[PDB]
Design a protein around this ligand. Structure first.
Ligand SMILES: O=[N+]([O-])c1ccc(OP(=O)(O)O)cc1
Lengths: 513, 513
């Protein structure tokens, strides 16, 4: 007769949150705790993994306490799910159970040398040399290269290898270990697919790649699915085992972007979501068979519910961040003071009237991957004003979105039936409209924006029988969490012409070096 | 003897001033009357010649009246100089003593069709066909075309020519005619060199060009030098004769840009001035023989002191968007509000850190005439701020002058000796510093910034024997009216880098259509 509840640890780049969902998929208690963004050298970023673990734990205790106040009958959480910033890589010790050093983060660039050394000496100049095993190019992001760095550069890690005590893992594995008090060394397929060490289609580790990249398989955890028993919460770090009252299984684990994909109900092929945040990503569910990319996209696991469940696959494109760009204009250029001005300034003109603004501040991502491109504005006259500039920026973000979707259609051989939006600037109507116009499809916007956290809880709830199937999940959602829907409103010669402007502008972005 | 004074009528585009100078060259009295800007169609601008005449007479009597009140040694004006907006052309009747229409202004675009006709039907498509005679390209600015336009399109002008009663003249000629009572019908070599009817080398009306453009040599006045007896003031309009008290000679006449060149003492070859106004006009003194441009620059007369005395020639170049760029950043982009904030913001960063801001809003004038070039910013990152964008705008202005100056050096076979500056933007200390650094010459900023008015006052005063030579003229200024100097303060590698970024950036400006 009382509510069943599922727990979600959302371990992000800048903070950690615990969200408790009820069986109707509503966030009923939340707590958030930030952690320190250590940047020792230009271009490095690094996290304290004990800080992360303690944050996770504080979030669970405070969230649990806040719910108890709201619902005094609630005795236990059915299960806990983990979603996490991917690729960020932790090194720890099997016996001390303690980190050997700080965790270099997804967008950290200390792995640059090692990246060229790998392309050159292991894959003769082709970045895409192992893209049929991993689904990925050689890039600074991926875990194996951070792993490599910490073996070369960090004495205690180099040391711990010798002794057979060295564990490596992405943040899912790290949290999941420490929560288990040391008893669990596992990872899920979505996180593993970002190591550069896993085979995309088998979802097993690749001895070819470990051997080549010089990573002892002893260090690596057991790959499992996203939805199944990973272990139990058995730490009393900030009272957590106490607050949970019963022993609580961890039955969900999944990378943030996939988790947003899962939690926005993109279960069918052609369904896709655009997430905002510390980084911005478009993922498309492409179906049961992997799709590789000739147009600079990543091939990756969408989700796999259960060991024997079918594996859904995805293509992934990183774009510009509406948010970063908007904040830059406000805080660096002073083109407005508060975010409400932004949309009105953009709305106050009927177009860019000639200008294009390519916000390639740290290179061009998406189907272009040009790290020499820098932020550029073209076409300005004495009549141009900050309204045009702000507008052009929002157009620019829709435009890379479109080139990325273009690339996805080609690689995947499918259409994008719908785009779901989530992360902050899904709340800008004008942007949602231009996106809607340019892609020629609908843009869904949930009123329960909390969908990244939800994915992991759905994973954990499915596994534990809170919800019974993907069908029930979808139904409860349709029934409980409402969803605004933005429809296209463009010509074709508008679309063709705005893109034509865009094409010419990109030619003028090459700057660095 | 007693104290001597010289008056200067500074007849500009938006207002007329009268400045009385004392023999130490200090402005001791000023009055300024504006006049109406008639814009009968887009791109057209014209002026009321009798309103301008009345403004000049008002300014004279008020400035005089004000001076008697504050200076008991001021008995009379020894001579009057006239400086004027060039190219603006007035048509009047020898017997009614009055205009037959309003006066098309220098930047008036009604002459467009006529100049296309002239380029094809007389140049075979080469706008430079008569540049070796005139020093000038075919353009809407120059007076013959405005003369042609009024002949063709203003029935009263056509008629007056037929009766033999039509007078054409640039503003100097008109002012000197009406002040004369209708006696003097004269022009000075600097004004005449902007007509497209003068042979640069001889300084005579070219019978061929008058014949070819079908402008009759009977409509034109006598070309004299800048400094000599032109006539006397013989009107009592707005009480001017009663105020002058004693009969007063007119002994100086000089086009505004050349007047600023003279007033800044640029008497030797290699000496130049730049007015930093809305746009920039740079003039270099190239010496005693004409020099023709192979970089699109204008060849003109600099000055001529005394009838048939030595005649110094100049090269002239513009930029369109100097102060307009500061202003644009203020009103269109909100990068700042008060005008003091501009220099403050630009100093707050050590440099542009990668970015170039090419402010070619109305296109590139200067030695790379390109109307397809538009406003563009390259090089931006998330570290970029309005401070950087502002500093880059200062650098841009300085980089164009550099390019302009570079072309003058090539055209003349001379080094830039030094650059004297005036205009509002010369008060921007950082811009002058950046400019000295790039040109590797001293920049001279006069504290008495009334340099246009002074040029004409000096011409009149030399001719009247208030000052006896140019050496004396220089001596008094160096002594009395103190100059600030700004020396180069940068490395040759910072110079060469900034110019290399500038040249790279210029290749990205092509946009319009
Ligand atoms: O540089 N200009 O374009 C420009 C030049 C002169 C103007 O008017 P003035 O200052 O009264 O002569 C106004 C604008």
């Amino acid at each position: 007769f009382t509510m069943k509840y599922v727990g979600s640890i959302d371990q992000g780049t800048t903070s950690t949150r615990f969200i408790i969902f009820d069986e109707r998929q509503r966030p009923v208690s939340v707590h958030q705790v930030p952690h320190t963004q250590h940047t020792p050298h230009p271009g490095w970023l690094e996290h304290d993994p004990m800080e992360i673990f303690r944050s996770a734990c504080k979030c669970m205790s405070v969230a649990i306490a806040k719910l108890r106040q709201k619902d005094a009958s609630f005795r236990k959480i059915e299960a806990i799910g983990i979603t996490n910033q991917r690729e960020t890589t932790v090194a720890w010790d099997r016996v001390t159970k303690e980190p050997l050093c700080y965790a270099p983060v997804w967008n950290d660039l200390r792995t640059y040398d090692i990246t060229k050394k790998v392309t050159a000496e292991l894959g003769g100049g082709d970045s895409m040399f192992a893209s049929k095993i991993t689904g990925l190019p050689v890039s600074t992001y991926f875990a194996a290269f951070k792993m490599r760095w910490m073996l070369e550069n960090v004495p205690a890690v180099a040391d711990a290898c010798r002794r057979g005590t060295l564990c490596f893992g992405t943040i899912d594995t790290w949290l999941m270990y420490k929560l288990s008090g040391g008893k669990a060394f596992v990872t899920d397929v979505t996180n593993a697919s970002r190591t550069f060490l896993m085979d995309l289609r088998t979802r097993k580790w690749s001895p070819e790649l470990c051997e080549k990249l010089k990573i002892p398989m002893e260090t690596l955890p057991e790959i499992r699915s996203n939805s199944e028993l990973f272990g139990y919460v058995e730490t009393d770090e900030c009272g957590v085992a106490a607050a949970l009252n019963e022993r609580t299984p961890i039955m969900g684990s999944i990378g943030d972007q996939q988790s947003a994909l899962f939690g926005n109900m993109c279960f069918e092929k052609g369904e896709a979501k655009n997430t905002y945040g510390t980084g911005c990503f478009l993922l498309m569910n492409v179906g049961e068979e992997a799709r590789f990319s000739k147009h600079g996209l990543l091939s990756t696991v969408g989700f796999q519910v259960g060991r024997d469940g079918p594996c859904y696959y995805a293509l992934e494109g990183a774009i510009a961040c509406a948010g970063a760009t908007v904040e830059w204009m406000r805080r660096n250029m002073n083109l407005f003071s508060h975010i409400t001005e932004c949309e009105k300034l953009a709305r106050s003109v009927p177009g860019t009237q000639g200008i294009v603004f390519v916000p390639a501040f740290s290179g061009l991502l998406a189907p272009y991957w040009d790290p020499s491109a820098r932020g550029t504005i073209v076409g300005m006259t004495l009549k141009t004003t900050r309204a045009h500039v702000i507008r052009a920026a929002l157009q620019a973000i829709a435009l890379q979105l479109n080139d990325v979707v273009g690339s996805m259609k080609r690689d995947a051989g499918l259409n994008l039936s719908s785009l779901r939006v989530d992360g902050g600037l899904s709340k800008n109507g004008l942007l949602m409209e231009i996106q809607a116009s340019l892609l020629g499809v609908d843009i869904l916007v949930p009123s329960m924006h909390e969908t990244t956290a939800l994915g992991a809880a759905l994973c954990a709830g499915l596994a534990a029988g809170v919800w019974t199937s993907l069908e029930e999940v979808k139904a409860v959602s349709r029934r409980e969490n409402s969803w605004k829907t933005v429809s296209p409103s463009g010509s074709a010669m508008e679309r063709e012409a705005m893109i034509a402007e865009w094409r010419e502008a990109l030619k003028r972005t090459k700057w660095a070096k």
